[PDB]
Design a protein around this ligand. Sequence first.
Ligand SMILES: CCNc1cc(C(=O)N[C@@H](Cc2ccccc2)[C@H](O)CNCc2cccc(OC)c2)cc2c1CCCS(=O)(=O)N2C
Length: 374
Amino acid sequence: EMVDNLRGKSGQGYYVEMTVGSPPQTLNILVDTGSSNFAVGAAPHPFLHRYYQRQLSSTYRDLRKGVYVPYTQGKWEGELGTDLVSIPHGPQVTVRANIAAITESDKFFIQGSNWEGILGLAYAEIARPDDSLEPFFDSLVKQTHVPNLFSLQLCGASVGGSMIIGGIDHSLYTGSLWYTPIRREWYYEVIIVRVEINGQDLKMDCKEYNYDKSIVDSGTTNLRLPKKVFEAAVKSIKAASSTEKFPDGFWLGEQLVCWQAGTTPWNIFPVISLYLMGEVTQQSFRITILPQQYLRPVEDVATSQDDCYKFAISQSSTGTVMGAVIMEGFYVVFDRARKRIGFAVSACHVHDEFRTAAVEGPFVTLDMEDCGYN
Ligand SMILES: CCNc1cc(C(=O)N[C@@H](Cc2ccccc2)[C@H](O)CNCc2cccc(OC)c2)cc2c1CCCS(=O)(=O)N2C
């Protein structure tokens, strides 16, 4: 019943079906671990197939307060209110929640995305206009008997996956679940203790990996890195892939790379290993990312004699973001109750006949430095 309740298009986010209001209005809502506002289109927009019509809901209540939310990509404004909300292919509950009714936006909605709103699944501390605006998942836990946990299985033109609310579906992963502590309940903030490119350590003070935070964000496409880590990573991947030479704009996300259909040279690209802080002192585990994840395919029938890709690793001035291209092929458990994040290899794991994505541990370390930036 909850398995395969997510759809999407590549680079455009993953969405679940929801209803808002009485009687219920059906909307597709992008799943975002990287924010904390539930918001839906509530006025006509060229890219919106449908929108929330507050005048048709008897349960709607205006809070008489505006809100503005700018993200890394896009922004919107609107009006706070509350209403009844359900998730048809989720738990069978109806909850009264805070809803921002988007009445104006800029570069937020995406042409042909199939979604009309966003579900911020992070904590109150980053909610706008402030932490008194109770996020949806908190409302759900408080009002129903749903356990304080959800899991995401994102799979890689159209895509799919599963959001499991209130527990863990063993059928969605193989091997062991490894847990990294949530350092601070605002974003799902975690700590990276080491980065290797094709087995070779980037040899940087580990605080750099976390300048000025590291988050797990289903609402952001790319792996985003602080400039210093980004520069060092690109150098290493360039070196590893030097059998071919790409335009500088490729590495900067300004240009596709294309190969004749079926001939993508996966093997010239390295594996990236991210080591996450363990639940025990100086211990860690690693998740390993194949180029099939960080070279994001760009579907376009005009270019379809070729397979074409964008480099899905980019530079950040606000810390590390482990985005959807990193999450895909892992089963990720947001165990809010025990303040930790679990990673396991998922049922839709990425792999060819030579290499596979993995979650492996434990790794131990002599160095007693705390890797947290602040
Ligand atoms: C298909 C979405 N594409 C992207 C979304 C977002 C994003 O801001 N995501 C928002 C949510 C969002 C989802 C869909 C459209 C627009 C936005 C995340 O919430 C960002 N998370 C961290 C954050 C950053 C700043 C403010 C903030 O307020 C809560 C939260 C960012 C980015 C992309 C794709 C372009 C390359 S990227 O992955 O490096 N990048 C800049």
